[PDB]
Design a binder for this molecule. Structure first.
Ligand SMILES: OC[C@H]1O[C@H](O[C@H]2[C@H](O)[C@@H](O)[C@@H](O[C@H]3[C@H](O)[C@@H](O)[C@@H](O)O[C@@H]3CO)O[C@@H]2CO)[C@H](O)[C@@H](O)[C@@H]1O
Ligand SMILES: OCCNc1ccc(Br)cc1
Length: 485
């Protein structure tokens, strides 16, 4: 960052050229240069560089609770008159611990996109896709192609019969109640895997492959968001945007994302960012400039949404959004997505069965795992990992210094042993089996807290597991004569 200018990060699938046009208008009126960038993995780079992060970060709201907890985002305090211009639902997406941590921009949900020439009557159920694919294959076409590398696209099907991320009850999420390995989640993922086994879909289909096949008239349907419509408009394919197919008679339940713009807590340009976001971007003209490049979906700005909702594609986006639910913005969402991404990729490739893939995802979707030990005794912490993925990497055990501090290295593999506070920590790695083991001797309350098992590569560290060490009292420490009769 540099004082007197704005650097913005936004994902490569969004209208970054339209956003740059709003930046050009801001520069024309004020002299302030606005640079819009679309780095790869920007959502993973942001917490590592936020140092030299951007002034503004755009992403769906699900990642922002984690950034806010880490102290990376400035609290936003728009006037009541400004808050009244955006929908209360969109403000709900960006409120964390009672404070607003980003400006909401647009509401997104996946829909079924279909080729009206190949399929004038798209299927209402997922169950009828195998027979439809057989008929289309006889004509050199396929029924459906969509991104199988990101769990966001398969989640509507996994959630349809009962899968869920974190149980919700009266404005709160229970982070201990995860629904990744229930009967409904297994049924949805088994249906997806059966589509691949029967050659109705390919496990390696990604965003680019599905978009190219649909936009070239090779597949009758795709599953995508509003941002994808402008490339289809250019392709001249006669497309429709409609309700996703049902599974076991239940609607598919897409996770609803609210594209949001957070202000970096370390930015010396917070006031410029606020003026740009409130008075340039979040205006009917500003949002239209972005929408014209890549559609936003249902915008957070009431005045513009009242017009956009007349677009049948936007009404279809809201119909699918209403069948699903808003993603939580809680810090625990990252772990949930990483676990489900792994389960889908492994089940689709045949590397794991659906049952084993979802059992591992259920365990790993929990951001932290408690390891309880008794004071004065030894505690063995286990960190399973993918031996192939982490082949050749050294490992580390680090202790989290508060909610916002660094994870401070304790021991690593090749100082693998550390004696401190009359106790000790030793790390051992079974590289063939994929199990990292940390042994804490003479466990005491001073050892309680959050730690990470890590896999190192270059100057980066991958989190293998977050562990909460809990220390039960030594039974002898309460030595007394109990009551008798
Ligand atoms: O898959 C690992 C991946 O998990 C998490 O990513 C999720 C996003 O945080 C979540 O917003 C959603 O992303 C979709 C966007 O909302 C949508 O606008 C569009 O850009 O498509 C995105 C899906 O590709 O879903 C993903 C999970 O698929 C986590 O935050 C990432 O760092 C991680 O790489
Ligand atoms: O060639 C198979 C041995 N190679 C290999 C590479 C990646 C994974 Br996942 C599994 C196996």
């Amino acid at each position: 960052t540099e004082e007197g200018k704005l650097v913005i990060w936004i994902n490569g699938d969004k209208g970054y050229n339209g956003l740059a046009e709003v930046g050009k208008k801001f520069e024309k009126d004020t002299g302030i240069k606005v640079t819009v960038e679309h780095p790869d993995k920007l959502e993973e780079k942001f917490p590592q560089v936020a140092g030299d992060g951007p002034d503004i970060i755009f992403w769906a709201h699900d990642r922002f609770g984690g950034y806010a907890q880490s102290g990376l985002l400035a609290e936003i305090t728009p006037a009541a008159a400004f808050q009244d211009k955006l929908y209360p639902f969109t403000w709900d997406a960006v409120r964390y611990n009672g404070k607003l941590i980003a400006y909401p921009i647009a509401v997104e949900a996946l829909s079924l996109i279909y080729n009206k020439d190949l399929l004038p009557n798209p299927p209402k159920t997922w169950e009828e896709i195998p027979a439809l694919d057989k008929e289309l294959k006889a004509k050199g076409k396929s029924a459906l192609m969509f991104n199988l590398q990101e769990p966001y696209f398969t989640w509507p099907l996994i959630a349809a019969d009962g899968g869920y991320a974190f149980k919700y009850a009266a404005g709160k999420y229970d982070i201990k109640d995860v629904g990744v390995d229930n009967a409904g989640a297994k049924a949805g993922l088994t249906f997806l895997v059966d589509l691949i086994k029967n050659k109705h879909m390919n496990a390696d289909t990604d965003y680019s492959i599905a978009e190219h096949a649909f936009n070239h008239g090779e597949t009758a349907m795709t599953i995508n968001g509003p941002w994808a419509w402008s490339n289809i408009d250019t392709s001249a394919v006669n497309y429709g945007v409609t309700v996703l197919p049902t599974f076991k008679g239940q609607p598919s339940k897409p996770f609803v994302g609210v594209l949001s713009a957070g202000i970096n807590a370390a930015s010396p340009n917070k006031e410029l960012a606020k003026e740009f976001l409130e008075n340039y971007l979040l205006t009917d003209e500003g949002l239209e400039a972005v929408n014209k490049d890549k559609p936003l979906g249902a915008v957070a700005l009431k005045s513009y949404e009242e017009e956009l909702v007349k677009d049948p594609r936007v009404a279809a986006t809201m119909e699918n959004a209403q069948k699903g639910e808003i993603m939580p913005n809680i810090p625990q969402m990252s772990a949930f997505w990483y676990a489900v991404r792994t389960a889908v990729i492994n089940a689709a490739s045949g590397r794991q069965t659906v049952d084993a893939a979802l059992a591992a995802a259920q365990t790993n979707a929990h951001d932290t795992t408690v390891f309880q030990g008794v004071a004065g005794q030894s505690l063995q912490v286990s960190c399973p990992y993918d031996s192939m993925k982490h082949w050749g990497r050294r490992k580390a055990w680090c202790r989290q210094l508060g909610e916002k501090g660094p994870c401070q290295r304790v021991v690593s593999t090749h100082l693998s042993f550390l004696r401190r506070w009359n106790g000790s920590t030793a790390i051992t790695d079974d590289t063939l089996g994929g199990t990292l083991t940390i042994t804490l001797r003479n466990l005491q309350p001073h050892d309680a807290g959050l730690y990470q098992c890590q896999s190192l590569h270059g100057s980066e560290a991958d989190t293998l597991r977050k562990v909460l060490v809990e220390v039960l009292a030594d039974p002898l420490d309460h030595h007394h004569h109990h009551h008798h009769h």
